[PDB]
Amino acid sequence: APDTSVSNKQNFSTDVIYQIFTDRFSDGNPANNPTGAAFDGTCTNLRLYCGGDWQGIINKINDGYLTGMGVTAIWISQPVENIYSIINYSGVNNTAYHGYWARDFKKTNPAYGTIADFQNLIAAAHAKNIKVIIDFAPNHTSPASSDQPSFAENGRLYDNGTLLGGYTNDTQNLFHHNGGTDFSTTENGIYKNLWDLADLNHNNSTVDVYLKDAIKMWLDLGIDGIRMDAVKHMPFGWQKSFMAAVNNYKPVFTFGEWFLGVNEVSPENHKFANESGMSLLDFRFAQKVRQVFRDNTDNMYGLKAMLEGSAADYAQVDDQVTFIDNHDMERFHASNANRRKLEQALAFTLTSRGVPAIYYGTEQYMSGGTDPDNRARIPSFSTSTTAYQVIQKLAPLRKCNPAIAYGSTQERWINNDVLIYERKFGSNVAVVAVNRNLNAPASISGLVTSLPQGSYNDVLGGLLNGNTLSVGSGGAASNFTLAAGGTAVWQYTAATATPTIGHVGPMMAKPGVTITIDGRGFGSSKGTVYFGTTAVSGADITSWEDTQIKVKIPAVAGGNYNIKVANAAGTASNVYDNFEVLSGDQVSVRFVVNNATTALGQNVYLTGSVSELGNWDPAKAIGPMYNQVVYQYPNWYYDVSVPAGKTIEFKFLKKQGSTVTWEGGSNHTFTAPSSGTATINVNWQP
Ligand SMILES: OC[C@H]1O[C@H](O[C@H]2[C@H](O)[C@@H](O)[C@@H](O)O[C@@H]2CO)[C@H](O)[C@@H](O)[C@@H]1O
Ligand SMILES: OC[C@H]1O[C@H](O[C@H]2[C@H](O)[C@@H](O)[C@@H](O)O[C@@H]2CO)[C@H](O)[C@@H](O)[C@@H]1O
Ligand SMILES: OC[C@H]1O[C@H](O[C@H]2[C@H](O)[C@@H](O)[C@@H](O)O[C@@H]2CO)[C@H](O)[C@@H](O)[C@@H]1O
Ligand SMILES: [Ca+2]
Ligand SMILES: [Ca+2]
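Above are the sequence and the calcium ion SMILES. Below is the predicted complex in structure-token form.
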């Protein structure tokens, strides 16, 4: 199959994701609606169940609403079983309508539907070329009170109907009993509870194994992707070990939520995206898009900088999921605002690098403050709006113009209010002009592009006041006036003669796993795939087409590799980097070193004998380790993903900048568990 096929569970870059709050979309089956006090069929009370379900979704798929828009993937609420208690939060009654209050990850939330409902969901979707994504929220269970066990469901956790345990009398230590986080530090928000939610302890093997098993079911259920909740609140290492579980089994595109505020740029965030095994919701993109197009607290120069920066910061920028709003922010559209802004931001998003996500109702111009005001019921399924039409015209380009899906981004023209950018991939080009100024047109002269000589009609057909463009030789455009609030898309497509890799997934796996290589110009005859200098040909290459190749990772040493491909003629492609070859299956192991005192600005790190531990390369040591919560300085700790059942030699180090100090003595040693977790505790050797 081609890269664009619905069967591509590894690449979403050519897709357009439609984010749905199940409960708030469409009540296809009233029979499964909660009753009594948990229910409000008028959906006036935004904290109760309104009745939205899977059947409703299926109906919307079948009646052309989503397909009509050009949407090719839907992202739905966490489908596992939620607690049934109604929680009164100081007068206000609250239900688990959101799906974030898990009780059993092996069962469905019956308000949404049955396993059978879910299966039909996957079927209808698939039938219409739509991929399915779910929210998965393994950080916690539900709201608990350790000394008020009668509160809610005490954060109880079941394994397919079997009671594993509760928040009160947690002798098994399923949960954390460290208090509530003040979000003050990263360590702090990982090992404490989030508000009153029962924090799962991933270091407890039961918990560990349980979630790894739970996700496999859903995987087996046919899901196309995972959206991880609160990744900034779980252990990094655990999460990676979790990723390996998915990839080593049945890989699917996974992306996590790691909130960024305005003007926030976190290096922790980049590292996680680059090394975890998953990608993230592009908060940096969102925040900036809003500042520029919505709040007007930043200009084009600001957008441009986000674009160039993020391309540098993320090893796989094309894997970040962009959006203009979601369930955690106010709805982009403000009641009294010019709709053009929302239209422009959509256009921008749809034509920019990443995996675009559309918050349900956007195309309907829904307004609404923060939770739960941004979660109202979709008021109508009209395809007549301008936003509906914009998506309709643009979404499909991601499938037909790889410049949009995989191309680089380049600023061609810029001022405070205007932004002209080029997307390029192979023989494909896309040119987008945006004029944020809703009151002033702009004189555009000097625009130079990669488009072939000729005239180009606005892909939006002038819907947002775009115009035609005239490209002379040398790709220089002749002067034109860009309308106030103007938006235009111009493009050029053509066959790519040379093999060009546009994407790879998964990005981390053990040998023997099949990965997917997307792009163009691979030709029809099997060529060769290189992993570093290692050549792979013949049988291990399970499939080869012009746009997609499927190959098994060779049994090479755990490490980071560069991928490249050669066609049957020996022509090589561009390199795709940062691919991680796991040492084998992984386990999450907690390392603890005692009495590792440091000076200010000096941190302890971990290194060792496997690629998972950086192979003795200080520049690749794990850390800095933690020293507040679970263990107190001068005792440091850290949760790490390691090859399972392997005997590993390790050492700790103190780093300051790039200056390193090694632990004295001989290597510490240990053997990783075959499964579940473990805790190694040692003393720093001077
Ligand atoms: O001429 C090529 C030139 O085009 C763009 O420069 C624009 C500039 O952004 C506008 O603000 C205005 O000054 O017109 C210039 C064209 O004369 C590119 O931004 C620039 O890098 C490139 O050299
Ligand atoms: O919270 C982690 C913190 O640990 C390290 O600082 C030590 C410092 O070296 C000691 O002299 C002592 O005063 O306690 C500190 C930990 O609270 C790192 O130096 C620091 O950058 C890091 O954040
Ligand atoms: O370079 C690989 C080498 O790294 C580590 O050796 C350290 C040693 O432990 C330190 O005390 C200090 O002398 O720096 C050496 C770095 O060359 C591992 O201990 C060793 O096994 C490994 O081969
Ligand atoms: Ca229902
Ligand atoms: Ca946590």
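The radius of gyration is 26 Å.
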